Every structure is written in C-alpha cells, then in structure tokens.
C-alpha cells in the first residue's frame, strides 16, 4: 500500500497492488485506499469492510 | 525440472514450469527435458543449449 502511495504521486495510471499477483492484475484501486478498505465485502455491505 | 518430471509421470498434459508464471502458463515441455534444453544458443547449429 505504501509503494502504491508513492506510485500514486508519480503515475497517471498507478496499477495498485500489481506486485501481489506478480504482473497479472492490479486489483486494488485508489478509492479503496482512500476508503481504507481492509478487504472485500466481509459479508455485509454497510461499509463494515471500510 | 524434478517437479515437471513428476507431473509428466502423473498427467497426460501438464503445465510444465508453471511456477515461474505464477499459475496461468507453461513454457517448457516434454521434449526439451528429454533433450536437456537449457537456452536458445545461437539457434542455427549450436548443440550446447541442447
């Protein structure tokens, strides 16, 4: 997340959490980080995972 | 290589060297192992790579 933070300053298209897959996909997004998402919908949807 | 040998023993058509990819590809193969391939070489006559 910190690396993505640095990369968000420097890139117009910061592929977030890309290294996690290893190059396949960057699943996370800026909106989740600003939301401080801990993980996917934990079963509920009232931002309990936010 | 050894894991690939096992997979060859087990499966009809295993994804060789799958680990290097991370789960979605294979780029080594049965005959390469049979002939001890190691790299491209000069690709015109060089048998060192094989």
């Amino acid at each position: 997340t910190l690396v993505d933070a640095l990369m968000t300053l420097l890139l117009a298209n910061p592929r977030y959490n890309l290294a996690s897959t290893g190059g396949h996909e960057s699943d996370r997004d800026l909106i989740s980080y600003v939301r401080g998402v801990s993980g996917p919908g934990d079963g509920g949807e009232g931002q309990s995972h936010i | 290589t050894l894991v690939d040998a096992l997979m060859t023993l087990l499966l009809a058509n295993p994804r060789y060297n799958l680990a290097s990819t991370g789960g979605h590809e294979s780029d080594r193969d049965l005959i390469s192992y049979v002939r001890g391939v190691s790299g491209p070489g000069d690709g015109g006559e060089g048998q060192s790579h094989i």
Binding site: - | G43, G44, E45, G46, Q47, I50
Partner: protein
C-alpha cells in the same frame, strides 16, 4: 440465386490454395487486397480447417492448418494436407538454405532482399555430406533435380539464368528448424569424425 464473392479475393484464394503462398513478389496487389480483407479469407478457409499465417515483414502470406487445441490424436490429421518426409538430400538442402536465410537476415536485417546463391558453391556443400555419385555432371544434374523438387514446394525459385537461385521467404516458417540444425551439425560433426 446467391451472391458471388469478390472476384479478386476468389483469385487470391485459389492461387494461395494451389501454391500455399501469396507474396508481394508474385501477386502484390492480391497481397494488398487480402491484407485489407483477411476476415473474408479466413471465413472462406475455416470450413476446411484451413487458415493463413501471415508475414508482413517479408511480404509473405501462407497457409496453415487451423485445427483447434488438445486434439484426440496428439498431432493433427487433416483429410487434405498429406504429409511428406523428405529424403536426406532435400532435407539437407533445406537446412542449408534455412541457415542461409538466417545468415542473410543476420547480416542484412529482416526483409532485406536475398542475395543469390551459386550452384557453384552448392555442389561443394552437397559434396560436404554426400560424397560423389560418380561425376561432377551427376552432382550438378541431381542438384538441379532437387532444386526443381524444392521449387515444387515453392521454397526456392527456379534455377536462374546464371546458375544461382533465390530463397523463398516461406523458409522463414518451415515445420521445425530445430530438426534441420540438429541434423546439420550432426552431419558435419559425423563427417569430421569419420575423415
């Protein structure tokens, strides 16, 4: 009753099926046409399990079995495309020409016009691995015979007016160049050991 395909496309298709190839050097305007209309081509071919592979660097169109993956028989079997296994002489000439093409593109880049190769140097090269049937005349005659056969597969031109020849970019996509080079190195090493 039914409409009829564009005549130019049908022309290119029929030629490409007679010779497995179409080229900027042979039907360059058909080449442009098919390049603008590849979907039509593949659509025409796909009922037959045929499909073109293309080479825009070297201005070569060519055919290739279109069959799908993971077949029941590990290697494809196609009702139309009967397969040949060449005699050593031919295979050797092909490997020679293949590494020739590779060397030419190494020194001249990809797509650079081929320089001509002399029968005068070929007969030596055949002599490298084939010994002697009894005379230089027989060597030259059988060399031209095999060159005729190769032109039959479209991999070379005809023996030109100056006893040189030119390579057909179809060589850039042979079946398995590893078979060629393994055999070539093995042959030269075998003759070096035997002598």
């Amino acid at each position: 009753s039914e409409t009829r395909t564009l005549q130019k496309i049908r022309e290119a298709t029929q030629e490409l099926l007679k010779y497995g190839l179409l080229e900027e050097a042979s039907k360059p305007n058909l080449y442009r046409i098919v390049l603008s209309h590849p979907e039509e081509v593949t659509r025409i071919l796909e009922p037959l399990d045929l499909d073109i592979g293309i080479d825009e660097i070297r201005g070569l169109l060519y055919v290739k079995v279109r069959l799908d993956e993971t077949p029941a028989q590990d290697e494809w079997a196609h009702p139309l495309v009967r397969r040949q296994r060449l005699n050593l002489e031919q295979s050797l000439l092909v490997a020679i020409l293949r590494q020739h093409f590779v060397a030419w593109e190494q020194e001249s880049g990809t797509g650079a016009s081929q320089a001509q190769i002399a029968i005068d140097d070929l007969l030596p090269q055949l002599q490298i691995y084939l010994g002697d049937p009894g005379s230089e005349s027989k060597e030259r005659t059988r060399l031209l015979t095999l060159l005729d056969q190769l032109k039959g597969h479209g991999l070379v031109t005809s023996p030109d007016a100056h006893e040189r020849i030119v390579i057909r970019p179809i060589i850039a996509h042979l079946a398995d160049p590893i078979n060629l080079q393994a055999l070539l190195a093995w042959l030269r090493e075998q003759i070096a050991q035997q002598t």
